[PDB]
């Protein structure tokens, strides 16, 4: 199979010693830097305002 040589390698040692997790409980209040708000007005009225410009 000539199509399977040269498979991409990141580290030559990965999975080379293969043999056949802690839950994260956040407690420190880290304030978010940004908030994902949507355009409050709907698309039709937003388009109307844009066309008004």
């Amino acid at each position: 199979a000539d199509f399977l040589k040269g498979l991409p390698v990141y580290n030559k040692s990965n999975f080379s010693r293969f043999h056949a997790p802690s839950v994260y409980l956040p407690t420190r209040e880290y304030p978010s830097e940004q908030i994902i708000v949507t355009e409050k007005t709907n698309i039709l009225l937003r388009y109307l305002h844009q066309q008004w410009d």
């Binding site: 990141y10 990965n14 997790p21 994260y24």
Partner: peptide, 28 residues
């Protein structure tokens, strides 16, 4: 090199190492 798996409400984070997958974290 991280593998991130979504099991419905869970997000598992593994680090690809020489021994395979090393489970690093699990986020609900």
């Amino acid at each position: 090199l991280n593998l991130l798996i979504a099991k419905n409400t869970r997000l598992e984070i593994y680090v690809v190492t020489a021994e395979g997958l090393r489970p690093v974290k699990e986020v609900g």
